[PDB]
Amino acid sequence: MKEENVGDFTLHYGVFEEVEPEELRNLADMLRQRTKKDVVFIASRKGDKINFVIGVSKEISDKVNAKEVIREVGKVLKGGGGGRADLAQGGGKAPDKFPEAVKLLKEILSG
């Protein structure tokens, strides 16, 4: 996975093959504990399905609401999502659309 600063945030993102959803969630959780400005968008492709997670540093939960953002990237990935402002997760039907979801998230983070 990659790291890129976007606006006042640090975005960590990547899509993995064959990672279990609960493992993916735990990884995202760990990665957003790093700093106070982390946004983590990671996904796991299992064949023609994709599971994805958004985790943010707790300090920026109001700024980047994972509840809202998960649904926005979820739409691109032909899926849904839900959770809390600091950590949310979903499943979708369009694994090949991850790059497009990442582009959207960067646009969201920049405003």
Strand order, main sheet: write it out. Answer: 1-2-3-4-6-5
Strand content: 35-45%
Number of helices: 3
CATH topology: Diaminopimelate Epimerase, Chain A, domain 1
Helix-strand layout with pairing:
Blueprint: E1 2-6, E2 9-17, H1 21-31, E3 38-46, E4 49-56, H2 66-76, E5 82-83, E6 87-92, H3 98-110
Parallel strand pairs: 2-3
Antiparallel strand pairs: 1-2, 3-4, 4-6, 5-6
Helix pairs in contact: 2-3
Structure, described:
Helices cover 32% and strands 35% of the residues. β5 (82-83) and β6 (87-92) form a beta hairpin. It has helices spanning 21-31, 66-76, 98-110, and strands spanning 2-6, 9-17, 38-46, 49-56, 82-83, 87-92. α2 packs antiparallel against α3. A six-stranded mixed β-sheet has the order 1-2-3-4-6-5, with helices on both faces. The radius of gyration is 12 Å and the shape is globular. It has 111 residues and is an alpha+beta fold. The chain is built from three helices and six strands, in the order ββαββαββα. The chain has one domain (1-111): Diaminopimelate Epimerase, Chain A, domain 1. It is found in: Cytoplasm.
